[PDB]
Amino acid sequence: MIGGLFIYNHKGEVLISRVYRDDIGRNAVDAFRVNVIHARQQVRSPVTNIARTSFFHVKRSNIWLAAVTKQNVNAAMVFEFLYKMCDVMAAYFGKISEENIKNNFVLIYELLDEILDFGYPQNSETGALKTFITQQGIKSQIGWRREGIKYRRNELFLDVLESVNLLMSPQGQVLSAHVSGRVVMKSYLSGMPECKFGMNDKIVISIAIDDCTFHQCVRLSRSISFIPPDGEFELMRYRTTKDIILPFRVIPLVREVGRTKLEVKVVIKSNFKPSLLAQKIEVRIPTPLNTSGVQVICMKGKAKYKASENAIVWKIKRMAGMKESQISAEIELLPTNDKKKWARPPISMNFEVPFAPSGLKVRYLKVFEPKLNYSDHDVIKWVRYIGRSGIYETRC
Amino acid sequence: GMRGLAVFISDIRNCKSKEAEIKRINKELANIRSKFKGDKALDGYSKKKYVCKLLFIFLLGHDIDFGHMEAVNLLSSNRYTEKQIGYLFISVLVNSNSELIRLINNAIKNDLASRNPTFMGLALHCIANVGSREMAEAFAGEIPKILVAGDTMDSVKQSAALCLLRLYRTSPDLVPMGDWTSRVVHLLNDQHLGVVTAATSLITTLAQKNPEEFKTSVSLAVSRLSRIVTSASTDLQDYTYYFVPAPWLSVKLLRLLQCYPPPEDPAVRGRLTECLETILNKAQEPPKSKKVQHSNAKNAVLFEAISLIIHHDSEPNLLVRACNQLGQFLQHRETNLRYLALESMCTLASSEFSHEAVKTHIETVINALKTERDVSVRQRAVDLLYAMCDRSNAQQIVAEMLSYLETADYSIREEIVLKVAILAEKYAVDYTWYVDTILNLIRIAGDYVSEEVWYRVIQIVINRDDVQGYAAKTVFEALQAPACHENLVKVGGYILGEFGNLIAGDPRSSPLIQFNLLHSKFHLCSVPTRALLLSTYIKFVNLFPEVKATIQDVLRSDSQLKNADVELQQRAVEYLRLSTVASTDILATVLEEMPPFPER
Amino acid sequence: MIRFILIQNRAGKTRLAKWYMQFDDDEKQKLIEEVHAVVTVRDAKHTNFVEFRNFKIIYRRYAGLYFCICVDVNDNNLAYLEAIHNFVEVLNEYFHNVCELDLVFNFYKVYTVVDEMFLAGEIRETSQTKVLKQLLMLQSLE
Amino acid sequence: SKYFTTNKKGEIFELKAELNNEKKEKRKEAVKKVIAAMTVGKDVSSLFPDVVNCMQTDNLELKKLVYLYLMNYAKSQPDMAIMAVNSFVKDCEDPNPLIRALAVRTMGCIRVDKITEYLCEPLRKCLKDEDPYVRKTAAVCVAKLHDINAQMVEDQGFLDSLRDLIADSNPMVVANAVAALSEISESHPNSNLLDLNPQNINKLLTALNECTEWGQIFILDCLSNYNPKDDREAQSICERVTPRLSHANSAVVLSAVKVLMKFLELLPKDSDYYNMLLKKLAPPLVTLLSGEPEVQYVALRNINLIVQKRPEILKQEIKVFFVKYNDPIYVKLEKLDIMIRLASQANIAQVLAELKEYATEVDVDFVRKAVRAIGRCAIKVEQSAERCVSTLLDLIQTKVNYVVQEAIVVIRDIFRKYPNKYESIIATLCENLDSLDEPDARAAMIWIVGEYAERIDNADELLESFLEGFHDESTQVQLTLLTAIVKLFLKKPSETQELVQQVLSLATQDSDNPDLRDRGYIYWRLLSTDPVTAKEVVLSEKPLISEETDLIEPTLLDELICHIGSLASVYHKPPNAFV
Numbered sequence A: 001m002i003g004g005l006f007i008y009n010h011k012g013e014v015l016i017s018r019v020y021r022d023d024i025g026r027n028a029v030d031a032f033r034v035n036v037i038h039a040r041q042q043v044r045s046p047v048t049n050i051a052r053t054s055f056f057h058v059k060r061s062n063i064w065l066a067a068v069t070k071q072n073v074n075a076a077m078v079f080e081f082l083y084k085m086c087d088v089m090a091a092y093f094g095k096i097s098e099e100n101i102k103n104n105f106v107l108i109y110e111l112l113d114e115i116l117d118f119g120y121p122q123n124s125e126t127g128a129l130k131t132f133i134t135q136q137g138i139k140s141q142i143g144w145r146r147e148g149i150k151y152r153r154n155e156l157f158l159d160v161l162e163s164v165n166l167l168m169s170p171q172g173q174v175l176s177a178h179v180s181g182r183v184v185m186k187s188y189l190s191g192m193p194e195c196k197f198g199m200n201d202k203i204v205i206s207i208a209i210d211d212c213t214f215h216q217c218v219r220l221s222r223s224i225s226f227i228p229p230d231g232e233f234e235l236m237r238y239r240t241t242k243d244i245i246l247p248f249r250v251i252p253l254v255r256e257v258g259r260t261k262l263e264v265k266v267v268i269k270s271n272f273k274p275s276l277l278a279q280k281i282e283v284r285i286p287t288p289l290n291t292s293g294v295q296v297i298c299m300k301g302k303a304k305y306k307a308s309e310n311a312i313v314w315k316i317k318r319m320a321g322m323k324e325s326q327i328s329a330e331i332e333l334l335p336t337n338d339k340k341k342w343a344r345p346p347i348s349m350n351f352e353v354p355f356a357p358s359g360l361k362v363r364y365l366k367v368f369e370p371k372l373n374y375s376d377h378d379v380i381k382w383v384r385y386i387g388r389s390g391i392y393e394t395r396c
Numbered sequence B: 001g002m003r004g005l006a007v008f009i010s011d012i013r014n015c016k017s018k019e020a021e022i023k024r025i026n027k028e029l030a031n032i033r034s035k036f037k038g039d040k041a042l043d044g045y046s047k048k049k050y051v052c053k054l055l056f057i058f059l060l061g062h063d064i065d066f067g068h069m070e071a072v073n074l075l076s077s078n079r080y081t082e083k084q085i086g087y088l089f090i091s092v093l094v095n096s097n098s099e100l101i102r103l104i105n106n107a108i109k110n111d112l113a114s115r116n117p118t119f120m121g122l123a124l125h126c127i128a129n130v131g132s133r134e135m136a137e138a139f140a141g142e143i144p145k146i147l148v149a150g151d152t153m154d155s156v157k158q159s160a161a162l163c164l165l166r167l168y169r170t171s172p173d174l175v176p177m178g179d180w181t182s183r184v185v186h187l188l189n190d191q192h193l194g195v196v197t198a199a200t201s202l203i204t205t206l207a208q209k210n211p212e213e214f215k216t217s218v219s220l221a222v223s224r225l226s227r228i229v230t231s232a233s234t235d236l237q238d239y240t241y242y243f244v245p246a247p248w249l250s251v252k253l254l255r256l257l258q259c260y261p262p263p264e265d266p267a268v269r270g271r272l273t274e275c276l277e278t279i280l281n282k283a284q285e286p287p288k289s290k291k292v293q294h295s296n297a298k299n300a301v302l303f304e305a306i307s308l309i310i311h312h313d314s315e316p317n318l319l320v321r322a323c324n325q326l327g328q329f330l331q332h333r334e335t336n337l338r339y340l341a342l343e344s345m346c347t348l349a350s351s352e353f354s355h356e357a358v359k360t361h362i363e364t365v366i367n368a369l370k371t372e373r374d375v376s377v378r379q380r381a382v383d384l385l386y387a388m389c390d391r392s393n394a395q396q397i398v399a400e401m402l403s404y405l406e407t408a409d410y411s412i413r414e415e416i417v418l419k420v421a422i423l424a425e426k427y428a429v430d431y432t433w434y435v436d437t438i439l440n441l442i443r444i445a446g447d448y449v450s451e452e453v454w455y456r457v458i459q460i461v462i463n464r465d466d467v468q469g470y471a472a473k474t475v476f477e478a479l480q481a482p483a484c485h486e487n488l489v490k491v492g493g494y495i496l497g498e499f500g501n502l503i504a505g506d507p508r509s510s511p512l513i514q515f516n517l518l519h520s521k522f523h524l525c526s527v528p529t530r531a532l533l534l535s536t537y538i539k540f541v542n543l544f545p546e547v548k549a550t551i552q553d554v555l556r557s558d559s560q561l562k563n564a565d566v567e568l569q570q571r572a573v574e575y576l577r578l579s580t581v582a583s584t585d586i587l588a589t590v591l592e593e594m595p596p597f598p599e600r
Numbered sequence C: 001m002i003r004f005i006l007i008q009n010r011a012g013k014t015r016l017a018k019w020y021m022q023f024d025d026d027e028k029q030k031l032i033e034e035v036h037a038v039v040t041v042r043d044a045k046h047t048n049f050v051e052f053r054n055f056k057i058i059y060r061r062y063a064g065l066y067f068c069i070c071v072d073v074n075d076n077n078l079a080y081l082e083a084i085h086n087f088v089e090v091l092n093e094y095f096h097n098v099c100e101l102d103l104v105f106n107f108y109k110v111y112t113v114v115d116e117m118f119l120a121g122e123i124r125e126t127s128q129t130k131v132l133k134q135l136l137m138l139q140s141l142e
Numbered sequence D: 001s002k003y004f005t006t007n008k009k010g011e012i013f014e015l016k017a018e019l020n021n022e023k024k025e026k027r028k029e030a031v032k033k034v035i036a037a038m039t040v041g042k043d044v045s046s047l048f049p050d051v052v053n054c055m056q057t058d059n060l061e062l063k064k065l066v067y068l069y070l071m072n073y074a075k076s077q078p079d080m081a082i083m084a085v086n087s088f089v090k091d092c093e094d095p096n097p098l099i100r101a102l103a104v105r106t107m108g109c110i111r112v113d114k115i116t117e118y119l120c121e122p123l124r125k126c127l128k129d130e131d132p133y134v135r136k137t138a139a140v141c142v143a144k145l146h147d148i149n150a151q152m153v154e155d156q157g158f159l160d161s162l163r164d165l166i167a168d169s170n171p172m173v174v175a176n177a178v179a180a181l182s183e184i185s186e187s188h189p190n191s192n193l194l195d196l197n198p199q200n201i202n203k204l205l206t207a208l209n210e211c212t213e214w215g216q217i218f219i220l221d222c223l224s225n226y227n228p229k230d231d232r233e234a235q236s237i238c239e240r241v242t243p244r245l246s247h248a249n250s251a252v253v254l255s256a257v258k259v260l261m262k263f264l265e266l267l268p269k270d271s272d273y274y275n276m277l278l279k280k281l282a283p284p285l286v287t288l289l290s291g292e293p294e295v296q297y298v299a300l301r302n303i304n305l306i307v308q309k310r311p312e313i314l315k316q317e318i319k320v321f322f323v324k325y326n327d328p329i330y331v332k333l334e335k336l337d338i339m340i341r342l343a344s345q346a347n348i349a350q351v352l353a354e355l356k357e358y359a360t361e362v363d364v365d366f367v368r369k370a371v372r373a374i375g376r377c378a379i380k381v382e383q384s385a386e387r388c389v390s391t392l393l394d395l396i397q398t399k400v401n402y403v404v405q406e407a408i409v410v411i412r413d414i415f416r417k418y419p420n421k422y423e424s425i426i427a428t429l430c431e432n433l434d435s436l437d438e439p440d441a442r443a444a445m446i447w448i449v450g451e452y453a454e455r456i457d458n459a460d461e462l463l464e465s466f467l468e469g470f471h472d473e474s475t476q477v478q479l480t481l482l483t484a485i486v487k488l489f490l491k492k493p494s495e496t497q498e499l500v501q502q503v504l505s506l507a508t509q510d511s512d513n514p515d516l517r518d519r520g521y522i523y524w525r526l527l528s529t530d531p532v533t534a535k536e537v538v539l540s541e542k543p544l545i546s547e548e549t550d551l552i553e554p555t556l557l558d559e560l561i562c563h564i565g566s567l568a569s570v571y572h573k574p575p576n577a578f579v
């Protein structure tokens, strides 16, 4: 029935597992790590099928619980079980966290061989269970917004502003990447409204570190709530390094014909939904110091060689998602300095994109003023997403 | 030595929770802070163990915000073990406290100024390890003196050389080229290969910005390499690793020589050539051991010599031998040697004395790719094919690229499909090669093919048509895989739409069959593609008035007219109306042969 | 040059860590993590070499332990790949059939050994005989 | 090499001494530590004899621990686990029912050739046992053996042995023979689960009530597989199921619902059984949308189907499917969907004051699906389309860029079910020619200026402004530009000659889209040809569309309604997509 239970940590490392049926190898785990734990532009749902294998999952804190089969299983069953496994578990060791999982490997194994024989949600209520489980869980335990602000029109604007950084090899290995962001909030709201803010999972709460800082007004306990400053302010700052959506791939083909010519063809691919427009695209393809000149050709946008820059600069006004484009140049080299290989500087890009390369998505902003007369249904609400290139580099 | 340390460590281990662990650590910190703050002196043994316990806790993650003064007193001890632990603490926890630096700097002066090699060692390592400006300022001037003095132990010179290397990297301005130059170079003749190694690393860095100053090292480096690579089995037994004589020194010596052009003195350049050919010979000699550690040491030396050969780019016979020997690594158990061979051959391919050498091995490259499991080795197999491909190769290479594609994993398709489109375009002698390539390209790997590329094919087909009924049959016998995919339907529904005629006569490729087949794709396609098929489909009533009725009743149907889309609803209406209304000479004046393109 | 050397068990725990470049502790912690994610995920069939950030890593595993050197891109892979093995034999000799707990309980000794063979981001002493001789002299001092 | 492998000291050697110490509270600890080890990936294979020796015990915790260890080797490396079969055998005889169950389950989790010799007979003995927990295991383990190769003739024994303990005293026991059996039966030779039925049905629908959470569920599932023949047969079965608005909030209800709906083919309402049932089925579904998010999703994916087949049932209860700001996107979408389907000719009053709520929230994806839902609305209820188009104007004047663009695209589909009825608004829509960055929005305007061309005397320099950057344009925007500038010429001449040149110029000559080229040509082969016969193929009446899309094939609907509980009800796809 259920073919496998896998408890994974936030890194997508399988902490603990049990395969109940032999049609579910290494293949299942990496499938679920790749397409769910490290989903990128994938539409989340609790169930997903990949390579004929279905995948159920609950998120608990920093833990993922995941059920798996290759069969026409009882959908509602699987989930209810996973809720009661999380009842039971918490009745031995409290929260469901790596730590607590880590301490209770032997308990957890024990519950599993009881709570779930061969794949069938067998008997498993807390007190009913004592009789068969010998082990014990190991436990472990204003001043920024003056008063009387009135506006005819209660408005709020959110701007998710992100900078995406990349260094990538010629073969397309992300060598390093990180995003830097912030949510700027600009609000004209009467009173002293408490706001309730919700987003997706993507932020947990020269070597870039994952971090997330909030404005003093923010309280944590799920979600974020605050009484905002009036006008414009920064709600949260963050840096992230996992699961970044690299809007462009740059595929370089640099071919040194001898020591005299140099063939450089470069292709960029827009890796986001087709219905979205990236703008202000530049590609900056460098050239070596001893270059007579350059014959460049391209059939999207415009390109020019610039000598003092030692670089070709190719510009494209718009490029929608899931397209390809290509520049080709033929470069000409007078080889004085006899010796010393040209050390290639990377190809860099500029761009602008109307989503967050981190994946961040704003899900709600609820406003509630207690004293005054207005209601969140009244508040006019604009969101915007500006995603921007930072140092976005590909070796060639 | 330290039972108290062992017990703490074991207690940390016996801990059944990150909570239990944190509790035992804080307990320890409390104890250590007492005893450091306390009134009863600690004997050395205790300062040593407690400083060592704090180092341990540091290395588990937690913060250590004291102890530094106790570690600094250990520098002033005359007990090795106490000193060591002291030098380790400050080497791992570097604190900025302008005072302690001063005291550490005195402790160094004294261990250097002693003449005990061990204490000189700790001192010199501490310097290499931290290498702070203030340290450079205290000692940058003295280190050369220790390095060249006639009386310092070998172990100390090894350490001084590298410490001197560190400070030159961190603080060049403190390491001017003084009067020690020739004595540093001279160490390349030492009897002690460890000293030779240390010196070679230093000089190498120094040669980068100071070549002329160390010009003399070339000859010494050459005489030494060649003595190393020819010595027997009863020579250099100290530095012999799995029967390969001093491999790391050899690699370092071939790397020093990459700071310079070919030796200027003809005898020397001769010697170096004997050397390079001796190494290359050894490659062809079978193993003296079946342990992979032996081939790895031998091939370290092989690869670095190959780099020296490329960088000189001045001995054609060596370059050819280099290629041929890389050529033999492409068939090899070791993924490591395959990877490196393919990599190092991409370098050789861009070079005159070596391009045609590299061509010699296409067969071998196409056969390794064909059988290769590792992704990164594949990638480089393909990168090399791309780098050697010319007029001669292009058809061979492209043929095999396409052959590879039919069974190729997904990882690779994108890069290959890209290189093909490109090679086709740079090199194909004749319009008609191209089209045969692109239609297959699209049949196998079309969802990676650009927009231009499936367009631009048919921008050219016009000017030399004469394969419209090739195009059609391939498109068709393509289309009749119960497999085939989207851009096939796009260009295949386009081709047959426009000339299905040259194959509607063939009786198992009839108009009715043609149609039904397109329509076995229809309700899985996109709209701009149904757009195409809802134009394909109307040219069909005209050329083939035999199946106009089966056409007409898919246009009148609900799904075509009451279609959510503007184009689908626009085309299914318009076209039902063109086949029912006006005339038939007016039908033919609308879906005719297709007046052809210009040239850009 | 060598940028850092890690020894790390399957489970991600560091048993030795030596830096030869300026890094903050966060950045160190980050790197040790990144190195673990890359290296544990590769099976015997892969190369021992892999590009990492703007450097590369040579690694090999012994039992439950991954030995990793991060070095510059132009450094000689197989030289370092065998520096790792040369270092592990010395360790094996010096602890007599080395085990992991040896490295834990004598961690401060492990840095003596590293310092003998490596310094300022370069190979220092490669002979197992001489390094042993020195390590055993160091041990007998007070 | 074999460096770091020594087992003469280190962690493993240490644990080895501990596994042989004669203080069991130290042996127990060792084996905890060993299990700990496996899970972190260490090689404890060499401790195996020592761990196995710890089973030679009184103590139960200790035996249970060794078991957990051997079980880790079960799927992991099956060979290893086999080495101690000669202890599972003479270890399912022991008293303590806990131990017998424990040794049977373990053997059945092993998978190699030599599992049959030793498991056969002791499973024969386990199905016959004073304890229901041991038969409850023995039961589930019959299944296990089935998977490892063999139709096993004696298995015909077992195949029966399952049956006979469906008439067993314990519901844990029975409801397990069933769940064991009903899956055994999906490796299908043509006669299994075979029918002693009125007993089978009668003794199951009693098991079903004293049962656990999970016993109910697999029973409910075995039922729906079988076909009755008569009214009162169906009738009585259904009243017995009825009390299932019960325990497992969700799987229990929805497996009930599955049953109550295969057996929905009756002589309905001479007396009104049919009409009680459909009244009953409203509340329990309804209450699922108060359970957990994930399960809300499955329930909604099932209501979806359900509501196509019997739209009566939840006709009145549109209120539960109202969006709660804080639900997951995926439970927001499936709701919205069913909000359209139950969207009656009455409620559209509120349904619309809801969809206006959402379209002004901060979740962009959902806002877009809202305004589109406000199209779906008007194109399924005309007694409201008028108020829609007003609602849509509200949002267009609130200026939110992405609300405006989605709003226009719906307006077109609306300008098309109800042609020639909202002609007034066109100038309010052309106010916002400014900022339609998205390509769909544009082609929505262009087609608007396409029909209704003469209603604007200014329809000229509108189209001329777009030709500037005529490239830079989604090819679908140019296809729409062309068809719409020849809808303009089949009326206005001479003023149009300024442009219809510069336009058709490019479709046939510049642009490389060979589908655009074809459609550009086709036209020039009409307009610069004959001014009268162009009209009748082009401006020909578009037929009225209906609400074409959101609706499933009723053959397929039926099949999926038979799968109400399962994955197929989530994917809306037949099983054979995922064999």
Ligand SMILES: O=P(O)(O)O[C@H]1[C@H](OP(=O)(O)O)[C@@H](OP(=O)(O)O)[C@H](OP(=O)(O)O)[C@@H](OP(=O)(O)O)[C@H]1OP(=O)(O)O
Pocket: B002, B003, B004, B005, B031, B049
């Ligand atoms: O300072 P104390 O509280 O008097 O006890 C310490 C402590 O003994 P315990 O660990 O059994 O509490 C030391 O271990 P640490 O926690 O300080 O590391 C131990 O040190 P060693 O095992 O390294 O010798 C030391 O022994 P000593 O002081 O003889 O060196 C011993 O002091 P006592 O002699 O008073 O027990």
